[PDB]
Amino acid sequence: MRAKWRKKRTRRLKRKRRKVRARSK
Amino acid sequence: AVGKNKRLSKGKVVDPFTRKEWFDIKAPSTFENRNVGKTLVNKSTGLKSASDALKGRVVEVCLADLQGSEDHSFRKIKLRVDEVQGKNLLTNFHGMDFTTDKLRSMVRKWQTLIEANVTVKTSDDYVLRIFAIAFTRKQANQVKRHSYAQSSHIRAIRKVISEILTKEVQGSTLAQLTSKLIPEVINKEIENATKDIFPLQNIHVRKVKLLKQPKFDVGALMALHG
Amino acid sequence: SINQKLALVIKSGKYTLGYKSTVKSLRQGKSKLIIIAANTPVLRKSELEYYAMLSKTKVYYFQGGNNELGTAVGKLFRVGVVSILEAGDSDILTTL
Amino acid sequence: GRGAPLAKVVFRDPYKYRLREEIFIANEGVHTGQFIYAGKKASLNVGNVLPLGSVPEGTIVSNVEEKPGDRGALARASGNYVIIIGHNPDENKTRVRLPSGAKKVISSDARGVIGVIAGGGRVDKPLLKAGRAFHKYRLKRNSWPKTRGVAMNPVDHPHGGGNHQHIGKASTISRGAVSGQKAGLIAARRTGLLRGSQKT
Amino acid sequence: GRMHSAGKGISSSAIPYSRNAPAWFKLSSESVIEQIVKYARKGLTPSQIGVLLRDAHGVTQARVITGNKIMRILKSNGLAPEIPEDLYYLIKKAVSVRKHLERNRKDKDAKFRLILIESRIHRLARYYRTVAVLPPNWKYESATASALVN
Amino acid sequence: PKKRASNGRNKKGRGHVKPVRCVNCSKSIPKDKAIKRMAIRNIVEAAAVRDLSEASVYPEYALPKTYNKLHYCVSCAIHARIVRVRSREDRKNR
Amino acid sequence: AKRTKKVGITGKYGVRYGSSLRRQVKKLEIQQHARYDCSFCGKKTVKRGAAGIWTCSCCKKTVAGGAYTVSTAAAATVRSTIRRLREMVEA
Amino acid sequence: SQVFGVARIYASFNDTFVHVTDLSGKETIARVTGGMKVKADRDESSPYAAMLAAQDVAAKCKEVGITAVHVKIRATGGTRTKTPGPGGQAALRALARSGLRIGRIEDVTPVPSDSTRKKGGRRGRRL
RNA sequence: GGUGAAAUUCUUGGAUUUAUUGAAGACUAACUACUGCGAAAGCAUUUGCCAAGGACGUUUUCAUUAAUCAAGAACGAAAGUUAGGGGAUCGAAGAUGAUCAGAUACCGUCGUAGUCUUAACCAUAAACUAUGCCGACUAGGGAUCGGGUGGUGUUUUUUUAAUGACCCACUCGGCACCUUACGAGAAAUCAAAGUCUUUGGGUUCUGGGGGGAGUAUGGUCGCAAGGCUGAAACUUAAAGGAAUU
């Protein structure tokens, strides 16, 4: 993958993890 | 695409040049050979007439044709029709424009383009925006092939160019200004006044376009076309 | 500059500050030049010009306010008009 | 009841020995004790009331009269002004851009106050609590609080009624509708969010 | 060099080797000393006194003509300014940018220059306080800076 | 590895210039980086002046020439054969 | 002693009305309650009265201006344009 | 002794325009173009179609009364091409060789003083 | 109208085109360069105002006040955010036209946010000269920018004074460039990337095989998007750099 696309993928995945985080904490 | 149009008329013969009459144009007395040309116009009817539809018109011609000589070919004079006299439309000075061939010819690289403009009102209340151009030149015995300026001589010559144009326009009429641009005496005045700052070359005035027209004054027109 | 000239006068010559003191100096004729800020009341300025014309003195206008005039003089407070009792070691009287 | 401060300018009666007091809407930069020169041959100064027929183009004016002898028609709200666009010498008429953005053509003998109406930027702070809105509307009229028609009974409002809270019919109401059916958007040419230029 | 810029140009004065000079000078030491204080009495800073005495009089430098320097002579005869001249002009320049930045706030270039000037003033003030020229508690106050320049 | 001392094209001491647009494919390129070719060609095609001269009012003497400056992107300049690749030794040639 | 670190003046509203609205009303109220100076006297004594009215306590001269600012930027630009037009026409 | 006109030969890609005009500019004579002579929609701007189009513009003008015209050959201009079309120079030869004398050729293509933006994006017309 | 070719779309309601204007916003061609300025980002119409800066000239003054920097602070492209103004072209999304086995990609026509500006945030880039800052020395050559010096030098106004613009020589600071390789480097290459096994001028920051990973968690800044600091478990014997055929 390109660096931009890999970083975008992990950023979206981080957004999803933080959205899941906000439900419990 | 003669056979590709599908919808030609969404709503659902006589040749139009039989109702058109030739009209011969004339030019100010500033230009020697008046002899402008001829133009079409719809025949004079009771609804719109021909004078009203021909009253507003600006015809563009070349100064070389007007003056007969050939050293004015790069300058084209724009004449505006404003009044008729029974099959001879009469014009007046409307502007001057340097042809694209000449303007892009003097514009070369490895030289400095000096430009300026002035908004000045004449004696006859003709608010005019006059443009001027100037290019730096390689003086004789010079070996450096750039011939650039230091941006301070440019401002100085720009100030001198502006005041020269202001002086020769404020204190004269439109007819006098037209009779002044043709001999190109303004270029001589500039090259006399800005020769102590930088040599320069191709001193010219670009456009004398009109901005505001005063009261119609059909009296001045009759003096123009004697 | 005018600010440097005023500072030199304040340092060397005799100066007085305020409006009543300026009027007193004009009355006694011990004044030569008066500098009035562009922020003083127009009535006060006009009366100052009347006194100056009666006493045959010079009038100068400071293109600022009372704060700027006080800063140029060298004081923290607000000065509306300064009367120059003695030039001292400066030249503000002879020039400008 | 008005967000624009008022200025009490008093004049001298030219025909009788008596002081006339006039109420003018205060403009930005106008202070007490200021001399206001109202008339035709005045100067282009803030607060002056020169007619629009003797001012240069691009002039910012206020309290513009629709017709001569109106004593204030347009630009009477805080922070609003009228822009002069041009003048016609023959058949004297001045062209004006109004605060709404609608082109207008008025007579050249319409007097207007030079400047910008004071109190500009008044609607830039949320009323925050209902008390501020109540106090603001009490000094104006009985138009607060306002009850939604969709929460009403079918007899008290056309949009009311039903087991749910829905309009039922289209909110857009034609211009040629009699009194009673005009509850919603009146002659709405377009609806929805205004995205892009308004093509004014 | 150029403490607060990227320049590296070298340009200064090259004094002559002759510590006893300029030979052709004929005026006395006392004559130039009373000229120094006369110029100092009319508000001229030591730099301008040397400049005026160098181009108008025959005084090449006031160190070989006299026994001391211009600032040294001013202090001895009682015409020494309270604050150093170089610091005085630096503070004068600083309040000029602050005056410029109080009306045209959107000038970020002036803000960067103002920080550079203020940093330069503080560095110079530290040396003067250390060398026991200014009061030990002397500080550069922005509000009081305009009053300090008088 | 590094190919040219001037990395993109003709830019040492500026850092940034206003970009220009290619005339062929509308590609945004820096003004220095763009390859410029000046067109001095006459308003008429090759030959055909003699046909114009016979049907020319006034003693000719017009012969206008159109002047235009064209900016080409790297992809378009190579594709249009205006700019061609060279050997390493020929690369240094100006 | 920095009783409030970010809330500032609008600590009266508490936790109500929303952070964004509190920030906007703080930004406008700071200028509304700020103290200005007379242009006719120079002393920092101009204070807001009613909406659009700015009256003082030393010089007592009252100025009409913005709702929360003694001089609107739009008003200043309009005044500059008016002065330029007057200078052009009266020359 | 010779009435004059203006050619206004608009030369671009996919189309070509020859529109004879009187000296003033209001009158319009023989606005025939190169797209109503070809049946391919790809040779509309081709030199072979401009000659056919200009063959009729020089006959209608002659029938009307116009014997000579001026020439102002132009391009699309704006911020798109700034270069003359493939068939613009062929159209000039067609009416010149049809007995219609010409003179004072001018280039009136609109050159912009850095106005608006050019379609294609920052990465170009990738094809 | 457009494309390699077509189509969507606009056209008896006159499209496209031409001529006379008007309004709106954006932008600063050609002149434009191995050219200038700025700490960097960056900055190209004219005029006026405001303050600032480098270089040069100096027989003016202070006098070692200096150089590099944890912490800390200012500025910081584009994009993005908040609330107004503005909103013409281009145009993340989206709607269609195609091409294609499939094409919500490349191509065509529309088009919202955005592109402009005001006030407040965001602190990122291939933000690169992939080369930190200060100082000293070392092979030559030419051109060029700014200032200065000299030459009855040339030209210029009143032929001839000045000044200005050019020629030659010199000097200081620059953006840089051409040829060589003492010297360095793995090589590509370098007037430094040289004066490093003959190892030492002063100072700051960063890296210790490739993935996991700039991820998880804990702090911290931010309205958010995101920024700063920042692992471990586990897995692998290879990745990676310059050149040769």
Swiss-Prot record, chain A:
What positions belong to coiled-coil segments?
Answer: none
Record note on quaternary structure: Component of the small ribosomal subunit (SSU). Mature yeast ribosomes consist of a small (40S) and a large (60S) subunit. The 40S small subunit contains 1 molecule of ribosomal RNA (18S rRNA) and 33 different proteins (encoded by 57 genes). The large 60S subunit contains 3 rRNA molecules (25S, 5.8S and 5S rRNA) and 46 different proteins (encoded by 81 genes).
Chain spans, region Disordered? 1-25
* Pfam family name, one: Ribosomal_L41
The cellular component terms of Gene Ontology attached to this UniProt record, alphabetical and capped at eight, are: cytosol; cytosolic large ribosomal subunit
Protein name, per record = Small ribosomal subunit protein eS32A
Q: Which GO terms describe its biological process?
A: cytoplasmic translation
Q: What does this protein do?
A: Component of the ribosome, a large ribonucleoprotein complex responsible for the synthesis of proteins in the cell. The small ribosomal subunit (SSU) binds messenger RNAs (mRNAs) and translates the encoded message by selecting cognate aminoacyl-transfer RNA (tRNA) molecules. The large subunit (LSU) contains the ribosomal catalytic site termed the peptidyl transferase center (PTC), which catalyzes the formation of peptide bonds, thereby polymerizing the amino acids delivered by tRNAs into a polypeptide chain.
Alphabetic keyword roster: Cytoplasm, Ribonucleoprotein, Ribosomal protein
Q: Which family does it belong to?
A: Belongs to the eukaryotic ribosomal protein eS32 family.
Q: Which GO terms describe its molecular function?
A: structural constituent of ribosome
Which parts pass through the membrane? none
Source organism per entry reads: Saccharomyces cerevisiae (strain ATCC 204508 / S288c) (Baker's yeast)
Answer whether the UniProt record assigns the keyword Transferase to this protein: no
UniProtKB/Swiss-Prot annotation, chain B:
Looking at the record, which segments are called Disordered?
1-13
Q: Which family does it belong to?
A: Belongs to the eukaryotic ribosomal protein eS1 family.
From the record, what ranges are coiled-coil?
A: none
Q: Does the keyword Acetylation apply?
A: yes
Q: Which residues cross the membrane?
A: none
Record-annotated disulphide pairs: none
Protein name, entry field? Small ribosomal subunit protein eS1A
Q: Pfam families recorded for this chain? A: Ribosomal_S3Ae (PF01015)
Curated annotation (Swiss-Prot), chain G:
GO: which molecular function terms? structural constituent of ribosome; zinc ion binding
Q: Which GO terms describe its cellular component?
A: cytosol; cytosolic large ribosomal subunit
Annotated localization = Cytoplasm
Q: Which Gene3D superfamilies match?
A: 2.20.25.30
Query: Is Isomerase among this UniProt entry's keywords?
Result: no
Q: Which UniProt keywords apply?
A: Cytoplasm, Metal-binding, Phosphoprotein, Ribonucleoprotein, Ribosomal protein, Zinc, Zinc-finger
Task: List the InterPro entries hit by this protein, alphabetically.
Answer: Ribosomal_eL37/eL43, Ribosomal_eL43, Ribosomal_protein_eL43, Ribosomal_zn-bd
Determine if Flavoprotein is one of this entry's keywords.
no
Q: Which GO terms describe its biological process?
A: cytoplasmic translation
Where does each C4-type zinc finger lie? 38-59
Q: Which residues carry this modification: Phosphoserine?
A: 39
Which PANTHER family does the entry link to? 60S RIBOSOMAL PROTEIN L37A, LARGE RIBOSOMAL SUBUNIT PROTEIN EL43
General remark: Present with 44600 molecules/cell in log phase SD medium. There are 2 genes for eL43 in yeast.
Q: Which family does it belong to?
A: Belongs to the eukaryotic ribosomal protein eL43 family.
Q: What task does this protein carry out?
A: Component of the ribosome, a large ribonucleoprotein complex responsible for the synthesis of proteins in the cell. The small ribosomal subunit (SSU) binds messenger RNAs (mRNAs) and translates the encoded message by selecting cognate aminoacyl-transfer RNA (tRNA) molecules. The large subunit (LSU) contains the ribosomal catalytic site termed the peptidyl transferase center (PTC), which catalyzes the formation of peptide bonds, thereby polymerizing the amino acids delivered by tRNAs into a polypeptide chain.
What is the protein name stated in its UniProt record?
Large ribosomal subunit protein eL43A
Native species: Saccharomyces cerevisiae (strain ATCC 204508 / S288c) (Baker's yeast)
Q: Which gene encodes it?
A: RPL43A
Swiss-Prot record, chain H:
Any one GO CC term of the record = nucleolus
Q: Which cysteines are joined by disulfide bonds?
A: none
Q: Which SUPFAM superfamilies match?
A: Translational machinery components (SSF53137)
Presence of keyword rRNA processing:
yes
One GO MF annotation is: small ribosomal subunit rRNA binding
Region (Disordered), start-end ranges: 107-127
Bias (Basic residues): 118-127
Mention any additional remark.
Present with 3370 molecules/cell in log phase SD medium. There are 2 genes for uS11 in yeast.
- What protein does this entry describe? Small ribosomal subunit protein uS11B
From which source organism is this entry? Saccharomyces cerevisiae (strain ATCC 204508 / S288c) (Baker's yeast)
